[PDB]
Amino acid sequence: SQQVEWVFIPVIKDVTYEFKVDNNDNITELYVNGNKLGPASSLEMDFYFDVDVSNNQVRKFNNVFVLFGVIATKDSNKIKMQLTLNPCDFVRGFVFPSQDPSQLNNIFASNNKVSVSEKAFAILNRKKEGAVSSTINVYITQNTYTGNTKIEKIQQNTIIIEKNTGIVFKIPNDMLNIFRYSTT
Amino acid sequence: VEWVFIPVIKDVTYEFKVDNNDNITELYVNGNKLGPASSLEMDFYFDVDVSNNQVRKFNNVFVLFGVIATKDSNKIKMQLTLNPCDFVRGFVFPSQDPSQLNNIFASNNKVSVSEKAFAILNRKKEGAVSSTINVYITQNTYTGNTKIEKIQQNTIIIEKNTGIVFKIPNDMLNIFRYSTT
């Protein structure tokens, strides 16, 4: 599973992230703005979310990756990330083991990707993260951003976790505050 | 004039020529001449104790995070790591002159970086620097392990027009450290 491409997926405003969870509590698909991303490895739901199954609620997000010196924006229907090298800039998100990387081109504004050491990222609420590869693919444009940046928050229903039963896990609104990021 | 970032690293030589007016007339990096595109006061880079002919401190030491530096052939090679614990320290210098800079850096590839992205140690009369800085960085990231390295005696030479060389005590040089492979 460490021989698979793991990719960084920024969680940003006006993009919807839908995780499909099966009867075994495994993630079968991630849809980013409706674009399907299949997992290469069997992928436990608890790699991303700690769920209180009894009242159908997310307790916390696990393995939230933070990359510094970059900003993110929405460009057309795609995620655009740019290098600033300013340590006060950051973009937060998930890592995902792509079964079929060619699916990633619909999600990101650039074809341009670089490998970044896994040690470069801060990882919040680390849990059973040994599966992740030692380098992470990051989709970043070739053009630096040198203008002013600001911190933005995501919207209430940015992340949706859909079980096979049709029932969604509740995510409290305050929990989304962990996904703040730098943008233009 | 867009200013350029110059990493100060171990087996590269840096020689500053200072005139009788205490202005820098040239910087030689590994023997490659770099002419200043504006008038450039010596005290932008160094403060000097006239009484014992010694450097007191280095000024305007710029720090770029998420990058490493190495010596490749006779040139400075900088690479992106995006690891905030990685950094490269150095000078900024006013030249836009691609000829002179191509002899110094391993890559032709440069990007503009906001001046606000850098930390500046011992900042002094730094208002002349442009709002973006040219950084010569290769197109290929480095994902291996890194370590912090220091420079040595005789890495930096400061030479007055008279032939006299300013003493730099070894402890002063500790301000120049950087992440490398």
UniProtKB/Swiss-Prot annotation, chain A:
Q: Name one GO biological process term.
A: defense response to virus
Q: Which UniProt keywords apply?
A: Antiviral defense
Q: Which cysteines are joined by disulfide bonds?
A: none
Keyword Signal annotated: no
Q: Which Pfam families match?
A: Cmr7b-like
Q: What does this protein do?
A: CRISPR (clustered regularly interspaced short palindromic repeat) is an adaptive immune system that provides protection against mobile genetic elements (viruses, transposable elements and conjugative plasmids). CRISPR clusters contain spacers, sequences complementary to antecedent mobile elements, and target invading nucleic acids. CRISPR clusters are transcribed and processed into CRISPR RNA (crRNA).
Task: Note the subunit structure.
Answer: Homodimer.
Membership in a protein family: Belongs to the CRISPR system Cmr7 family.
Designated name of the protein: Putative CRISPR system CMR subunit Cmr7 2
Annotated source species = Saccharolobus solfataricus (strain ATCC 35092 / DSM 1617 / JCM 11322 / P2)
Q: What high-level taxonomic lineage is stated for the organism? A: Archaea, Thermoproteota, Thermoprotei, Sulfolobales, Sulfolobaceae
